[PDB]
Every structure is written in C-alpha cells, then in structure tokens.
Design a protein around this nucleic acid. Sequence first.
RNA 1: GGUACGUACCC
RNA 2: GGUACGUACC
Length: 670
Amino acid sequence: SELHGYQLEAVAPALRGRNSIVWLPTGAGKTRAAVHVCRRHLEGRRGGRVAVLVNKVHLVQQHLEKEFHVLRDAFKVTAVSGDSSHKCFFGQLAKGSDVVICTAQILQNALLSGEEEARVELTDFSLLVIDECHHTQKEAVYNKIMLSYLQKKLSGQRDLPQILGLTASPGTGGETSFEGAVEHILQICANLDTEVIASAQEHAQHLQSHVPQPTKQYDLCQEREQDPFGQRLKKIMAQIQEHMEMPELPQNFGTQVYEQRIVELENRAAERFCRKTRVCALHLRRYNDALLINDTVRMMDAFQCLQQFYADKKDPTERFLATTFEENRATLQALAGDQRYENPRLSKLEEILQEHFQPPGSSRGIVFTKTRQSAHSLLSWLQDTAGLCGQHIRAAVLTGSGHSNQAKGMTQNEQQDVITLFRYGELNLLFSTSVAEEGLDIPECNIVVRYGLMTNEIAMVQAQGRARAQNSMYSVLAKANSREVYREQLNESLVGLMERAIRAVQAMPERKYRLKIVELQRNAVLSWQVKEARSSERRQLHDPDDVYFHCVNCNVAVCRGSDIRTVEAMHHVNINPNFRFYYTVSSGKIHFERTFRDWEPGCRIVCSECRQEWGMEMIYRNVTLPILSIKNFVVVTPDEKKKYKKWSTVTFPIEEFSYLEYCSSTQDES
RNA sequence: GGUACGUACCC
RNA sequence: GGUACGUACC
Ligand SMILES: Nc1ncnc2c1ncn2[C@@H]1O[C@H](COP(=O)(O)OP(=O)(O)O)[C@@H](O)[C@H]1O
Ligand code: ALF
Ligand SMILES: [Mg+2]
Ligand SMILES: [Mg+2]
Ligand SMILES: [Zn+2]
C-alpha cells in the first residue's frame, strides 16, 4: 500500500511547510496522503503536535483504524469523540499525544474552555489536518476555529500551525457564473489560509484510470394515477379550514410551502393567544405531514403518523377535530391497505433492487434518504415486500445522532456496528441519511441510490463517491419533471464550473492571489467584529426583570428573564426556588446514551395548569434544576410578544450559572 | 431531552 | 425575517 504518484505530488507543498488544500477525487486516498504528511512533519522537528478534525462521529474511528494507527510504530495517537469524552479532560489527552483525532466541535469546546485542565490554544499544535474542508465557510465549527486563526494571524501572532485541508469538492457556493465560482474558491482559500491548492496535474492519467467513476442513470417515476388516500386527507384539511372561519387560508395542501404558512399561523396564534386558531393549525400540520409521508413512502406509514396523533389524547375545538378524524379513520386505513394505489417511488425502488440484488446478494448498496423516519420506513417496506423476500437482502438503517419525536438517533457504537457488518457483507444494503454521504469508505460498495433528494452539488458528488467499487452504478430516483431532477442536472454542470474555477485559481499570478487573500481575510475579521457588536446590541435592549415567559399553550406567566441562568453556555435553567409551583414532573427518569461530566437528566416537566411540555430536570451534581426549552414559550418584553426558536436572539442578557453561589443562597432558607 | 450550526425551501 | 430537515456538541 505504498503512496501513488498523484498522492506524493498532491502533498509536495505540505511537505515543504506550506498551507495547502489537497484536491483529489472521492476515494483517491486523501487520508493516506495526510498520514504521510503527518509522519514527515513529526519526524522533522521535536515536540510537534497534530490535530486531525472530522465532521461526523464515525470518521474518527474509521480514520484511526484504517490509516492513522500506522503512526503508532513511533508516535502516540489518540482518538476523542463525544461518547468517550466525559472520562478525560481534552487538554491533558492532546498534550500527552503526538496526534489527536477528533470531531471539530470537541476541539472548539477545548479552545473556549475556562478550566485549566481542558483548555487548549491553537499554538499547542504545529499542524492541523481538516477533513472535508469545504465545510470551512460561514459559521460552521470548522470556520469558527479558522476565523480565530485568521484574527491571530492578522494581529501578528507567530507559531500558528500549518493547515492541511482535504476535499474532493470545494463547491461553487450557490454561484452559477465563472466569476462567482472563482470568487467562492478564493473565499475558501482565504478561510483556510491556503498558499497552494495542490492536485494531480502531472499524474492526471494514472488518477483517471484507477479511481473509477460510477455509471449514472436517472430512474424517473410518475405521479400516482389514483391517490384516494391523499385526496381524502385533502378533503379533511378543507373541512377543518372552513370551521376556522378565516379568509386567505392557504390551499396548496401536501407541500413544504403550506407547512411553512400553517406553522407561521400557529406562531401568530400563540403570540396573540387565539387558542382556537392555534389548535386547528397544529392539527392541520399533522395532516400535512401525512401527505408528505404519503408522497415519499407507503400510505400506511402516513396513516400511522396520523392515527398515533389522535390516539394519544374535552374542549369544543379538539372535540370537533377528534370527531372529524374518527369519521374518516376506518376508510383511510382500508385505502392504505389497497395495493392498487401503490407509491411509484417504491415500485421503482423495487425494480432497481430486484435487478441488482440478483444473484441474491453480490451487490453492496446504500440508498440515501433525507429523513431518519423515511429510512426506517423504507426498511419496513423492504421487509414487508414479497417480490424481494426470496432474494437475500440483509438491510439496516444508518443515521447520525440527530433526534426528535418522529425518529430517534443512533449513537457512535450503534452506527459503528452497522458500518462494520456492511463493510464485508454481513449486511449488504443500507438505508442512510446524509450522515454517510461523505468520508465513509466501503471498498466493495457498488451501488448508490439517491431517493428524491434536493441537495447542492457537493452532496451529490460526495454521495456518489461512496460507491468505491469497479463497475459501480449511481441512480437518481426521483419524480419526472420535478425540481429535484432539474437541480441534479444543474449540479452536474456546477461540478464542471467548480473544476474550471479551481484551475483558474491555481494558474493565477502569485502576487495577484496573495493580495486577494489578504483582502478577503481582512473583510472576514471585520465582518465578524461588526456582526458580534450587532448581536450584543440586541442582547442588551431590555432589563431581564422586564421580560416575562408565558406558556405557549395556555399563555399563563411562568417566570422572568432574571430567573434564567446558562449551564455550559447552552442549558437555560430557572434558579428561582418557587418555580416548582408552576411546573409538574410528568415522567419517570430519562436515560441517555451519552453521559456527561457534571450532570445527568432527571424527569420531563410540564406546565402545571395545561400540561404543555416545557423541558427537563438536570441533576447537576447535588442539586436538581429545571431546564427550559425556548420553543415552549412566548416571550413578552416591553416592545412585543414573540415565540423564539433560538436563545441567541433574545433581547435581554443571561448570566452563566454558578453552582457555588446557588448552593449558598438555597442553603440559607431551610 | 437541551444547544448550535449547515443544507433545502419561502419571503 | 421565517419554515423544514439533517448533523455535531452537551
Ligand atoms: N497508496 C494506496 N494504495 C492502496 N490503497 C490506498 C492507497 N491510498 C489509499 N488507499 C485506500 O483507498 C481507499 C480510499 O481512501 P480514502 O482516504 O477513504 O479516500 P478519500 O480521498 O475520499 O478520503 C481506502 O480504502 C484507502 O485505504
Ligand atoms: F473524498 Al472522500 F472519503 F474524503 F470520498
Ligand atoms: Mg428536541
Ligand atoms: Mg475521505
Ligand atoms: Zn400552560
């Protein structure tokens, strides 16, 4: 497994100490090239230290086990992710290592830490390797780390680390002209403090006939001729809107636009406390989710989302709605049972799998879907489909750690189990989210299907690339004449523009490039400063005593701004000793997969008057504190009443929690 | 469960 | 300015 010519060529500038981006195709071997750069870096000085940053939990282990472990003949290499996190302080672990591999946010947390044992500076490393470095833009973690690097650089700081970015796809950043695309490439160079974009110019022929391209096919599907299940949902949505007695109610049932309008209505009804309107809007949204699920997967998947909503449950509005569902329930379930009205997305997916998993399972595939819920539903569909039950498909779901009431996440270990069985064919088919669109290496994977996705060209290129095998195939499975098909074709062209843009940046005169980089780095550090000042202005508009929180459901006042403190600059706790008379504990003890350094979860908490979900208890060392979720309240200030979805935009200051001070004050009372 | 960011969409 | 989803951290 000695380095290919093009790998040695792409790291020549890195070996000379220059900051670079290594631009090589998906599956070309950027990781092994980085390892070689790390070895020579560490051999060439004493006391060097490398950090290797990734953007998914699963890439930490993959990169350690498949590539970086070889450095252990001479050097100390440690991996840190979230799951393991809580045992060691990161500062101690890094400083005791020659190479640390971690998700970027782990490093960022250490860079911001107040504790001496956890804290790190950028100057504690001599080389940073940034995997999938195209994410180093905007306010992503990668770019927060690098903007601090730029601030320091521009302020004269010395011995900042060398930067080695790795990517197959810098992208065009939404730009469709050559001018724009070039401007985007230079911004990424500026963000990463890049001196050279290194590629395989002199080994372009070896790289062509070695790293194979999958052959590409459009597997287009038609709209259902007859959708009586959908038609019936739409009738009910109209009946509910009639009952609401409101003009200018939107009519485009079964779309993301309708979903936006109806949630925006629900926000307004919460803000003005129109209880009737808010309740109807909440139900209508649920009918709209069912239509969307219906278009994506099975009728019965859509039916079950709706039925679980009405089964969990008085006042006259809710009673109208319960009755309306009950009137239609049996008919909806019977329609969902009928094979005549099958989703042609699914018929089309069946053909593909039928053709490519015969002989029974020589193929090795990933079907990409947008949502975790869709991936689970597709697995169920596979298992209850006879046309495939006969061939031997051992399938599983792969998701990241994202989580909601619609679908839970998968931990590091649970992801790893699926990946390991897929690698050598114990599993031969994954239903996956974008968790696995980049970086994942399965040499034998020979089939990628992208199931009705709407993404940028980076995600298209990257997901294709998971098919590492010779003779791979890539399928676009989408609706004919859709926006999704249009975007796919546009993205193909945007990949070409991206290439043209990079080559133009690569051939620029050195003086003209350096001045442009300088100009862009300056504007970045100034733009950030201005943005920070503007965020702080907003944060100090109101005294915390003049802000009141109301329950989003019943509008009762529950606490003031001055009752709130932050734990780890994230979790908003109410420290008022009488807040306990306003909330009720509504569950038994909640258990997470991950465990944290200073706290564990207690029970869910609800509004004592209406039972609306508010948040959860945190058992922080020796005390129990209620954590509030901003989405479950209307915030009332002197100027307005506003339902917030984030805490960063609130108009009053919130201090950090002090465990010490809190104990003193609570222990004085009884 | 909490927090943040990214992508897509609408304005 | 919002809506949805995803991932990462806790
Ligand atoms: N010089 C080499 N010889 C043989 N195999 C290699 C070489 N370099 C990389 N590989 C293998 O090629 C595959 C793709 O590498 P990877 O680092 O995942 O690609 P990417 O460039 O997309 O990060 C891996 O399985 C890796 O072990
Ligand atoms: F470009 Al890669 F894994 F880094 F496909
Ligand atoms: Mg949540
Ligand atoms: Mg890679
Ligand atoms: Zn309430």
